[PDB]
Structures are given as structure tokens and as C-alpha cells.
Amino acid sequence: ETTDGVYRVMTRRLLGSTQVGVGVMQEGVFHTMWHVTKGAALRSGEGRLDPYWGDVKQDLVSYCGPWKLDAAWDGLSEVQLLAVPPGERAKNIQTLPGIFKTKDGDIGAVALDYPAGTSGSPILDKCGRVIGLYGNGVVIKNGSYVSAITQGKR
């Protein structure tokens, strides 16, 4: 129920499911973005995953344990978005990140546009490590999107 991998985050009403996000299972901890779940508990098979930590400002939340993802973009190399869009198979998209320049330091950022329910898809370095999650960003003048490479602290 906590095997490593990338997962869809789904909601189910009286009929039909909707994909609201994506997340990463690693070291028995599920990692996703706060706006996906609002910190709500997650069903996994027959089991229940409980929120352990979160931060609305970072837009992150972990389940079952502390945040485990600590790989960092090197500021130099191309990365891969492992996009898991609603209703579509997971696909790798390689890209060279731009940068968010903030008063509190620079954050890598990827100029890739996907539906809301792709939020939480992991961004990978060349060794397959997760350097952050996709889905919190800005819209620029031509209507396209730039996502921060959002990484938490371990």
C-alpha cells in the first residue's frame, strides 16, 4: 500500500472519479502538493494514509512520515517532468529549467503546461531522483505557464 512509485490522487463521489493530483511514494512516505489534498487523509487500497506534515506556503504535504525528497536541481542540467495527466499515461518530458528569482533566493522553474490535475507530478534529475514537484507557478503574458520546481526540506 506504500510501494515506491508515482501515483494518481483521485476523488470519488456517487459516480465516477476525478483526478485532482499526483504524488510520489518514497521510503514509506507519500509526497504531494497541499492544494491537491488540502491535507485530507488518503485511501490506499484497503489502508489509510494520514497527513504527517505540511506547509501551505510551500504548497507541500507529506503522509505517514516526514518529507523524504531532498535531491536538488544543480542549476545547470536538463531535467524530466514525469507528467501524469488525468486520463493519460505517465510520460517523461525533458526540459532545461528557467529560474524564479525571489527575494529569498532562486528556484528552478519549468515552462511546461498541463491540466490542473497534473499537480504533484515529480520532476527528475538524470539519476531518477525527485528534485521537486510540478504544479505551483505563474502565468505569463502569452498565457503559458511556468511551474516552480517545488522541493521540501528533510
Binding site: 490522487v9 485511501r43 506556503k57 504548497d59
Partner: protein, 39 residues
């Protein structure tokens, strides 16, 4: 509300992948609600 997860794949790098998108450098701000904005 039933919120649940389902496996979607293994987390691996893909050799000979598609290289797409630009590399913008943007001045941005972040508020206490976690929202980015252009500066």
C-alpha cells in the same frame, strides 16, 4: 469525499526523451498563502 491513490508508474528517467520548452528567468514573489506572482 473518498480521496484515494492509485499507482501510475515507476519513477525513472527516460533515455532519448523529448526536449521541449524554454528556460525563462522571471522575478517573482511568494505570499503566505503559497501563491507566486510576477514582480
Amino acid at each position: 469525499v473518498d480521496m484515494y491513490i492509485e499507482r501510475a508508474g515507476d519513477i525513472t528517467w527516460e533515455k532519448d526523451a523529448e526536449v521541449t520548452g524554454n528556460s525563462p528567468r522571471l522575478d517573482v514573489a511568494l505570499d503566505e498563502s503559497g501563491d507566486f506572482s510576477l514582480v
